Amino acid sequence: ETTDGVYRVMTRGSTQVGVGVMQEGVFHTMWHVTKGAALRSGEGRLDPYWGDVKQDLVSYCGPWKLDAAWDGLSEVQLLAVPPGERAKNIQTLPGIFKTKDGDIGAVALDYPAGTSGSPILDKCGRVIGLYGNGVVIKNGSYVSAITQGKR
Amino acid sequence: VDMYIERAGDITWEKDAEVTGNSPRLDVALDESGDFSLVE
Numbered sequence: 001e002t003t004d005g006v007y008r009v010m011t012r013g014s015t016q017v018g019v020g021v022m023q024e025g026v027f028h029t030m031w032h033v034t035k036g037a038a039l040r041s042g043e044g045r046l047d048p049y050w051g052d053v054k055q056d057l058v059s060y061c062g063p064w065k066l067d068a069a070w071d072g073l074s075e076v077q078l079l080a081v082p083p084g085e086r087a088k089n090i091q092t093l094p095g096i097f098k099t100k101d102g103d104i105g106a107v108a109l110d111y112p113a114g115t116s117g118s119p120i121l122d123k124c125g126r127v128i129g130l131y132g133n134g135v136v137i138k139n140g141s142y143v144s145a146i147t148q149g150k151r
Numbered sequence: 152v153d154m155y156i157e158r159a160g161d162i163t164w165e166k167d168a169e170v171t172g173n174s175p176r177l178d179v180a181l182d183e184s185g186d187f188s189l190v191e
């Protein structure tokens with residue numbers, strides 16, 4: 001089934017390779033998690049519908065549905081789903097990735113590789129992007145873009 | 152290779168949540184493979 005929620009992405013003992021969001025009958029995750037491979041959901045199969053390696057995003061079953069945007073001002077919550085750990089909300093004020101093509105919100109929170117795809121939320125619970133494509137800074141810590149697609 | 156999904160939770164804002172982390176302002180570039188890098 002495709003019931004709304006946050007999901008672990010597993011491979012098979014099993015390994016957690018990432019995370020994603022079911023919304024409006026579409027599964028959303030980061031491209032580097034699945035490489036567009038088909039996903040088993042219960043007894044069903046989810047097939048890739050759209051993707052873009054440069055955005056590092058892929059959707060299954062239909063077009064990208066997540067269209068909420070960080071307001072550039074407010075605190076957000078990472079709904080982190082780390083491998084082997086319960087989902088947990090982490091509140092933070094985003095920094096900024098300043099690029100030649102505009103600014104992107106970015107969160108300075110560090111989690112294992114298989115946390116990739118965990119959703120980032122605004123105060124209304126809308127998903128404003130996915131966690132896990134970022135950079136490593138001089139002290140070794142991590143900053144993730146708030147990666148959002150186009151609906 | 153069997154790739155599958157399993158539900159992990161409801162997508163909800165937590166009303167009394169830990170506020171943490173800093174808010175860095177970074178100049179970065181994005182190549183065609185979707186990789187960010189720091190500029191310097």
Ligand SMILES: N=C(N)N[C@@H]1CCCCNC(=O)[C@H](Cc2cccc(CN)c2)NC(=O)[C@H](CCCCN)NC(=O)Cc2cccc(c2)CNC(=O)[C@@H](CC2CCCCC2)NC1=O
Pocket residue numbers: 032056110111112113114115116131132133134135136140141142184185186187188
């Ligand atoms: N402090 C560090 N390094 N934190 C990272 C946090 C990873 C969060 C999920 N995202 C990823 O795995 C992607 C994958 C990916 C990789 C490459 C391309 C793409 C697609 N364009 C995706 N990756 C990243 O974005 C960055 C990208 C950098 C791009 C530069 N042009 N790549 C790394 O970080 C690689 C790296 C570097 C040094 C050391 C490590 C990995 C090993 N570190 C880990 O094992 C965990 C350790 C955590 C465990 C929980 C407690 C806190 C520490 N951390 C970490 O792994």
